[PDB]
Amino acid sequence: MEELRSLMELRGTEAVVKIKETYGDTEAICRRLKTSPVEGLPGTAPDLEKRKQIFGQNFIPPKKPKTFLQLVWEALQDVTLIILEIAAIISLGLSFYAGWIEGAAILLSVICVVLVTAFNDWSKEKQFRGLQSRIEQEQKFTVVRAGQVVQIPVAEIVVGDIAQIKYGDLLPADGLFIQGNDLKIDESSLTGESDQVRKSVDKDPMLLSGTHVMEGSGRMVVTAVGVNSQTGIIFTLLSVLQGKLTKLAVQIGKAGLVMSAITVIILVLYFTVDTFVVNKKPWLTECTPVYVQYFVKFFIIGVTVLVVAVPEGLPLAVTISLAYSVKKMMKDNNLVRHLDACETMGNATAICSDKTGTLTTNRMTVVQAYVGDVHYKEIPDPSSINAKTLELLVNAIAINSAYTTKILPPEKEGALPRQVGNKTECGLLGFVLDLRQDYEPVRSQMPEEKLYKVYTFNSVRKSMSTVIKMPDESFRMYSKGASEIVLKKCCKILSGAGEARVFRPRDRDEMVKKVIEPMACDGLRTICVAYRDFPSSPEPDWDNENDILNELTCICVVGIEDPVRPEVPEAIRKCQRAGITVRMVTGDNINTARAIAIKCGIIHPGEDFLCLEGKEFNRRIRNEKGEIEQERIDKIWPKLRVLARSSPTDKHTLVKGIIDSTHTEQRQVVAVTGDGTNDGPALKKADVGFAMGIAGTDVAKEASDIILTDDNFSSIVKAVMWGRNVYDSISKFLQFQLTVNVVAVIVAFTGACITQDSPLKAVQMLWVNLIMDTFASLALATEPPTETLLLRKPYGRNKPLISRTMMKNILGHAVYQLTLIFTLLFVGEKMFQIDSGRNAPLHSPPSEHYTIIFNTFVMMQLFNEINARKIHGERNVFDGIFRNPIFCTIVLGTFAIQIVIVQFGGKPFSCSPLQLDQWMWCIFIGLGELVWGQVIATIPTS
């Protein structure tokens, strides 16, 4: 908000000259902020709190959630509830011309429902909010406080903080450039220009929030945070399953509508015909109110059919499942940024993964060496080596490798030493330490000033070299290479007694077959260490590095192995069992990639699978002219398992080729697990993209739907399982609700055809509606997953929601319930000896006959709620019933509330107290429900 906000607007070199005019240099800005210099920050709590309040602002917009009263107001305005309320009001008013005890009851019952439903919403949204909070907690940035480098949440960054910038980082706030090395930033998110701007103190020290750090490293001081930032200004001043469920909802709704209309009209017609035509009665308008009362009652019951027939909240159920699964998924190391990608993971039919990090632990160690012309499958003794070559070897390894890569001491709790920096370099350093020497003295003899010619390691060269001026009137070149680029360049071997032997193509061709090829076949990356001498020539032309990196002398060749994680073989086996093919994309040579793939079980030994490289892949997919053609891709991808020596765009090419091919009968759903600065677009092309949390760039995490917090391939399998569970949960819920509304409706209609009333009154029907819609969804939609879900092939996009077994269960249980209820309604007077409540006159007291019918209906529904938990014809209903406490709580609470309703509160609910005998008979029928379920489970559907 201060002059720092106006400081932004470089647009060239305006800011540097403005600073030179007003403030002087960056040091004046640093002291103005009352901030410690590049050394560190005070970090005192009261001061940071004060400058958080006044100097800056919390880096979090509030996003403005909604309230409970708004939810109840939105739930109240349902049209059918308004119709029911106006009907109740009319009946209550007309009853005065204790009948009112009916109408009033209905009103109160409605006020209950519109409460509970609203509460349900206010619960589920809360869950989602919690998840979002956790995501904001996982965003952390590296800062310097009290002279210590610590990681803090991005929301804690305040003005004046010293933030350290590394490649791949997402800039959280607007700041000033202080010091660093070759810092190149992409500013395409604010300017639209996708070129790498080089930031320097004397040219352009502005760093903008929201930009991507493409290369280099350094430090910066924060000036603008939050709404005061440049990117905050723009922010201010401005599903297959759900779609498939909606059609079922509307179809059932219209069927219920026509059924209710038919019931109302047949009641009115029969009443009028019987009262007037047959028993000839004069109109006698003096007694005309009674007639209209007879109509209003009819109308009410029609409405109470409709509210039960139309499924409201059927397409919403999916979200409820997510709201009670997502949190638990976080305990399986799956942080879900986009919820839509959850259920999509159920239908995944391909996974493209990368070798390092995901499948291999990235713990580089040296297990084989060839130094001394003798193959050494074990680490030799320091004395057993050739004379005087160990000093040269350790000198080459120490001086060549970057000095920033320091193996931290193993002060962790009984743990292996921690590795920092390039993995190959620190692996070689650990190998040097394993021979019982110390590179620390050799590195201490040489600061950075003494070295004068170092070639920075880059993937094009695949090698890195340095030049040392220590030898008098001479220079020495040390080089590490990929063991394939530099073996051609070396002209002599230091071997035998230390004397150089002339290296020839003749013995090179056989030595590559003896050691290098088997070394790669054991899944070992091969690295060659060599050196060269430069005499005191007048001027060695280091500019022409092509000729300078030649005629070297091979000191040694070393194999480095990154062990495969113990869980990923079984994980890949389980993935392949569930119909999900797995492919590997890596930058190693084809031999090592093939060996590691065989170790992981991706490619079996005796199988026809292509293991072609990246260059061959690009050449094949562009045979004609120089463009990509889908037909050519259509031949490689179906049998492409391992892709080695690839490039960042090759993954995108493969992903799009698989995703948009029409060759397959079934549409393919891919799930790429990329993680990198240049691996953005691919993650967006695939259906769902996984990122790595422990060691992953912020650019990769920004574009990913799911974050794996263990950086493990196995957790991916978990995601698939959870996704499938969602589908299943919906199915079982859909198996219960439908059954109820197949029975209830029919019962009402049949009563309307024979008697002149329905056995189920209005408030009882609202109770049944509450049971079938909210409590059923909470009980059944939230079911824990099992590993057995991974034993079926992924479902197609086009397939009916109601399967064969679901429809068989619906029909059978509806048949049993209908038979029992009709038999009761017609012969209960003689079965129980309780008189008959049939054809009761208007305003009659409640009878035990209809109360028994209602009670047995509710008991059958509860035991069918227990039966509904098994979809695939499983006989054992009670399997894992105590894994879900919500189910038990809801079922037992409904049972207790039913016991309270039948006994007490009789007149408003049209119930009469029941003896113990009738309660036991009702529960006997309820258990007969489960017995008949076991009976029907043996009918073969095919």
């Binding site: 309780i834 054992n876 113990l916 008979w921 258990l927 007969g928």
Partner: protein
């Protein structure tokens, strides 16, 4: 003694014709103050005028109206002169219990409250294989109390073997008769046991199936 000439008695039938009851104070040497119609000793509303001759018109005569009408004459210092007009009708039961459900070894009560005049003699009958034979008070467990328009039958220490049946109140009088019936049901003390056995059988067969097949 004042002389009052009253209209003849009327038998209320189903005809809707209004009925007029007349009293005429033909001989009275005293100063009349007022007169009033009463039925069964209950003053009738809005019947107090000069009314040296009384008329009562009933537009819709029904069985509930028939009774012992009186036209009472009250003077300065003479005793009130009442006379009598009696209106009869067939008896009719207004209220009765449809059924009586009690556990064995308890107290059972039934009643038949009716209306009419003359007050009906009440007799109770019990169904015996299709013919309503008279009720026998052999065991001394039946108690019948008769009143003007009310009857009450009480049974003590219900036995599940003989008592269950249908009981009728016959309610005869000098015009006609009217009878209604009630059903008595006696419940055993062992009723809850059978569904419990059914539940046990269901549970054991369910457990057997589930255990065997898994």
């Amino acid at each position: 003694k004042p002389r009052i000439v009253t209209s003849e008695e009327v038998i209320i039938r189903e005809s809707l014709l209004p009925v007029t009851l007349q009293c005429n104070l033909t001989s009275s040497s005293h100063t009349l103050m007022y007169s009033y119609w009463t039925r069964n000793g209950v003053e009738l509303t809005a019947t107090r005028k000069n009314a040296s001759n009384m008329e009562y018109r009933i537009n819709k005569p029904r069985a509930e109206d028939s009774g012992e009408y009186h036209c009472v004459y009250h003077f300065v210092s003479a005793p009130k002169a009442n006379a009598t007009i009696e209106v009869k009708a067939a008896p009719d039961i207004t209220g009765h219990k449809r059924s009586e459900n009690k556990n064995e070894g308890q107290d059972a009560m039934m009643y038949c409250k009716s209306v009419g005049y003359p007050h009906p003699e009440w007799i109770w009958r019990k169904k015996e294989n299709g013919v309503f034979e008279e009720i026998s008070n052999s065991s001394g467990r039946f108690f019948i109390t008769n009143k003007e328009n009310y009857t009450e039958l009480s049974i003590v220490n219900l036995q599940i073997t003989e008592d269950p049946g249908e009981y009728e109140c016959n309610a005869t009088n000098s015009i006609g008769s009217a009878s209604v019936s009630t059903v008595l049901r006696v419940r055993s003390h062992l009723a809850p046991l059978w569904p419990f056995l059914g539940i046990l059988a269901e549970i054991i067969i369910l457990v057997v199936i589930i255990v065997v097949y898994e």
